[PDB]
Amino acid sequence: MNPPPPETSNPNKPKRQTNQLQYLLRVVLKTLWKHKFAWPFQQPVDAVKLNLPDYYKIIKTPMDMGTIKKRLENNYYWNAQECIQDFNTMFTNCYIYNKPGDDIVLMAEALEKLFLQKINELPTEE
Ligand SMILES: COc1ccc(-c2cn(C)c(=O)c3cc(C(=O)NC4CCS(=O)(=O)CC4)sc23)cc1OC
Ligand SMILES: [Ca+2]
Numbered sequence: 001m002n003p004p005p006p007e008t009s010n011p012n013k014p015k016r017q018t019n020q021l022q023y024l025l026r027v028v029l030k031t032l033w034k035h036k037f038a039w040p041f042q043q044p045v046d047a048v049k050l051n052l053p054d055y056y057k058i059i060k061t062p063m064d065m066g067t068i069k070k071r072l073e074n075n076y077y078w079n080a081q082e083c084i085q086d087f088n089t090m091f092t093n094c095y096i097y098n099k100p101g102d103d104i105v106l107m108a109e110a111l112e113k114l115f116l117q118k119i120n121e122l123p124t125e126e
Contacts, residue, residue, distance in 0.1 A: 003056055005044045006063060008070035013078075019126050020080035025072040028118040033065060035114065037107035041065045041090060058097055063090040080122065087115055 032038055043066040047055040056062070063086050070076075077083045094108040 002044070002046060002048055003062070006067045007076075008067060009074045009076060013076065015075040016078045017075050018080065020122050021072065021075075021077060021083060023123055024080060024083050024119075025069070028115065028122075029065065029069055029072060031118050032111055032115060033069070035111060037110050038065065040104060040107060041094075041111065055097065059093045061089055062093060063087075065090065084119065091115075 033042065041064055044062060044064050045052070045055055045059075047053065068083065068086050068090070071086070072083065091108050091112045094104060098105050
């Protein structure tokens, strides 16, 4: 079985919007989401459908851009660092689970490169 997906809201977690969080949704996530290689990362890994019975034996901190998108839309994060951590977790999971130089790894590496280019212009907190 698949695990439940990561939460995208939590009534006990303080919510916030900041201009860096806006930029993460409006520019960074937008750019990655529309990229040709986004598709394997737009939703939680369906280990059942993909026949990966060991995926969640190995990956205990799953993350995907669909979750990140909903979190941003829900103002789930307190700061940009929390969101950046989620992107980094998503990339890292892909590197942990897959052989180096598998096509999925190259895709994640391309998205990570673009991610860093886009966050290079993250605005100051105003
Ligand atoms: C909607 O279709 C997909 C949705 C998600 C994925 C996918 C996403 N992510 C993040 C992964 O890490 C991932 C890993 C996958 C995979 O098949 N890996 C195995 C084959 C390559 S390996 O031997 O390096 C490790 C085991 S499929 C997949 C692949 C899909 O189609 C191929
Ligand atoms: Ca392949």
